[PDB]
Amino acid sequence: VNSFSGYLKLTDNVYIKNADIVEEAKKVKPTVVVNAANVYLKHGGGVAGALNKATNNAMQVESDDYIATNGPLKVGGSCVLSGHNLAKHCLHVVGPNVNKGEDIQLLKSAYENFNQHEVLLAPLLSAGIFGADPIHSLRVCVDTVRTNVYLAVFDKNLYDKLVSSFL
Numbered sequence: 755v756n757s758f759s760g761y762l763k764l765t766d767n768v769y770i771k772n773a774d775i776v777e778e779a780k781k782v783k784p785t786v787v788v789n790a791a792n793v794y795l796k797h798g799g800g801v802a803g804a805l806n807k808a809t810n811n812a813m814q815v816e817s818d819d820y821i822a823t824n825g826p827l828k829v830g831g832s833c834v835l836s837g838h839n840l841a842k843h844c845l846h847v848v849g850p851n852v853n854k855g856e857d858i859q860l861l862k863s864a865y866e867n868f869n870q871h872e873v874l875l876a877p878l879l880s881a882g883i884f885g886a887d888p889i890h891s892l893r894v895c896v897d898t899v900r901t902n903v904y905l906a907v908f909d910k911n912l913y914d915k916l917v918s919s920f921l
Contacts, residue, residue, distance in 0.1 A: 756873060757782050758904045764920060767902050768895060772913035775801060775877055775906040776808045779840035784904075787837055788868070788876035789813075790884065791846035793826040795833075800883040809838040817846070829856050830863035845871060852885030861891065865898040873902045882908075892916055 761769035771778070779787045790801040795817035797806035806813040816835055827833060832847040849864040850856035864879050878895065880886035888907075895903065907913040 756902075758784075758875075761904055762917060764892075765896055767900060768905065769903070770892075770905045770907060770913070770916065772908075772910050773906040774804075774908055775875065776804050776840070778904075778906050779805075779837075779875060780808070782875065783841060784837075784873065784875040785842045786845050786871045786874045787841035787843075788874055788879075789844050789846045790877050790879060790882070791827070791832075791848050792851065793829060793831075793848055795821055795827070795846060801877045805840065805844070808840060812836075812838050813844065830860040832864075832867035841875070845874065847879060849880035849884055849891075850886070852880065853883070858886060858890075861886065861894050862898050865895055868895075868899045868903055869901055871901055873904075875904045875906060877906060877908075888912055888916060889919055892920065 761771045763769055789805050797803055797814050827848050829848050829850055832845055835844050837844045847864050847867050850860040861880050868874055878888050878891040881888040881891050
């Protein structure tokens with residue numbers, strides 16, 4: 755038993771809700787919140803900009819030190835940093851950005867990072883400003899992640915489309 759509430763169950767291990775991931779994190783304080791990161795951990799917009807704003811820019815300060823030490827992430831890769839006031843940990847995961855011409859096949863590699871964590875609160879990778887089809891992202895999630903994932907979808911209209919079209 756865990757503290758996630760109001761989710762629709764899609765499969766044995768994948769759950770979905772129309773929710774703002776920032777507010778969901780603030781209430782649940784999950785062990786892991788996933789950020790929709792880029793390779794530079796520049797949290798300007800989308801989910802990343804919203805999560806970073808909710809940390810009063812502490813996420814960005816920590817991220818800049820990480821990059822100065824380690825260099826950029828790989829597309830499809832991840833790193834574990836602090837969850838600040840939102841979660842114990844933040845798993846920064848880089849899905850391919852279609853608006854940068856990155857290979858969509860890397861979306862499966864990106865979701866594989868979730869399997870290193872027993873339970874996660876997450877957005878749909880490569881959705882929103884990353885330019886991929888969210889229906890496709892949900893399918894890859896279900897077919898790749900084996901651990902327990904609670905997906906927050908900000909847009910109510912998109913949420914309804916994702917549920918109604920789910921196979």
